[PDB]
Design a protein around this ligand. Structure first.
Ligand SMILES: Cc1cc2nc3c(=O)[nH]c(=O)nc-3n(C[C@H](O)[C@H](O)[C@H](O)COP(=O)(O)OP(=O)(O)OC[C@H]3O[C@@H](n4cnc5c(N)ncnc54)[C@H](O)[C@@H]3O)c2cc1C
Length: 376
């Protein structure tokens, strides 16, 4: 009968709690520094294998009623023509859809599942992990609550699912490099459309200056009303931009005036990028950052999961897909081995080398495309 503390109730944390629960793992509590839990963020992509996991955990219909089953990816040239096209999700041969979904809508689905299945008490909101120590088979936590009081908690396992600015990671890896800048500035947003193609096709494009665009629908609710909520991502070399901010924060409001100049010359014909940016309901900015590959994640009875373990550039199958798949492996590891520290090790030896493969390949692809863009 082990008691598990999870720092962070983001996508990785909630989903892990669910995997643990399904695997029959017992007492799980999670600690979230935010006072209340909010549907923040913009569109994200859930790859088929992670949707498979979420469906296995009984989330299939909640996803089906929220997210878009993206069936197609088109890359279009600067005149609007489809150059490359590919199937996605079931049509591409996967047993499950890829789901394009609003992050905060996904978080709410996860939060409700956890609340229903292990009681409202499982999610301790307003409680950020600050101090950590492993002492005699037991993890001992200093936390601080809403309106400032310190709190002491203990557990058999501590799972650091606490995102980009992970305190558990910082405890475990005090010699870590700062966030690594990939050299690309991103703006993110949502715009309302009546129709955007068939409502389930992802669009990609780029400049001769390597300004890239990604736009895809993310809302089943809108589609069921005739409408389309189109998520968009604008990616611009930071060498073009200069320093937009001293911060890397998932909720940083961006400026129409910073991003538009880069897209203003576009004439796609069928798709109006100026209109897309101009009618945003939200612009956020974010510098494309990751962290260096670690040779190890955890130590003793403390491990790492999600962005805390392996922050990657937010594209494709990175992010939530990897965090959900981490949780599956951790629950399975913990279920299989009675000796907790060996289970925790067995979990990351499954997940770390893959995560490090992706980090290094992403950097290299990015590097190569930038070098190519830079020649005259
Ligand atoms: C508000 C917000 C908006 C986001 N928007 C997007 C987006 O638009 N696009 C995208 O790709 N990704 C977004 N992300 C990141 C995305 O959720 C993750 O990259 C990915 O899905 C894996 O999530 P994760 O659980 O590892 O980290 P996260 O989802 O970032 O979860 C980390 C959680 O831990 C909490 N936390 C941090 N420190 C502590 C601590 N000291 N103690 C306890 N809790 C702590 C954070 O508040 C957060 O809730 C967003 C994250 C957040 C928090």
């Amino acid at each position: 009968p082990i008691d598990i503390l999870i720092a962070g109730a983001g996508i990785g944390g909630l989903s892990c709690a669910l995997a643990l629960h399904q695997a029959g793992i017992g007492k799980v509590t999670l600690l979230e520094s935010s006072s209340e839990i909010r549907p923040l963020g913009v569109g994200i992509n859930i790859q088929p294998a992670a949707v498979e996991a979420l469906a296995e955990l009984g989330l299939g219909p909640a996803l089906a009623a929220t997210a878009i089953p993206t069936h197609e990816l088109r890359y279009i040239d600067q005149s609007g023509a489809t150059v490359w096209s590919e199937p996605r999700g079931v049509e591409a041969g996967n047993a499950y859809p890829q789901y394009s979904i609003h992050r905060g809508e996904l978080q709410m689905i996860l939060l409700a599942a956890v609340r229903e299945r292990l009681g409202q008490q499982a999610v301790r909101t307003g409680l950020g992990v600050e101090r950590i120590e492993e002492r005699d088979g037991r993890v001992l936590i200093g936390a601080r609550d809403g309106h400032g009081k310190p709190q002491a908690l203990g557990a058999d396992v501590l799972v650091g699912a606490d995102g980009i600015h992970s305190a558990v990671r910082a405890h475990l890896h005090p010699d870590q490099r700062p966030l690594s800048h990939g050299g690309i500035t991103m703006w993110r947003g949502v715009t309302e459309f009546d129709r955007f193609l068939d409502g389930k096709t992802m669009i990609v494009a780029n400049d001769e200056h390597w300004s890239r665009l990604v736009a895809y629908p993310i809302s089943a609710r809108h589609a069921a009303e005739g409408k389309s909520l189109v998520n968009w991502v604008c990616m611009v070399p930071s060498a073009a931009v200069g320093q937009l901010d001293n911060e890397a924060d998932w909720n940083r409001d961006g400026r129409l005036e910073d991003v538009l100049p880069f897209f203003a010359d576009w004439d796609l014909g069928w798709f109006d990028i100026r209109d897309l940016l101009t009618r945003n309901q939200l612009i956020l900015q974010y510098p494309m950052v990751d962290r260096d590959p670690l040779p190890h994640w955890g130590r003793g009875r403390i491990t790492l999961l999600g962005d805390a373990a392996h922050l990657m550039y937010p594209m494709g199958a990175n992010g939530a897909s990897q965090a959900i798949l981490d949780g599956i492996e951790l629950a399975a590891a913990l279920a299989r081995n009675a000796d907790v520290a060996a289970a925790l090790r067995e979990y990351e030896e499954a997940r770390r080398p893959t995560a490090n493969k992706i980090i290094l390949a992403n950097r290299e692809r990015e590097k190569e495309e930038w070098a190519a863009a830079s020649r005259p």
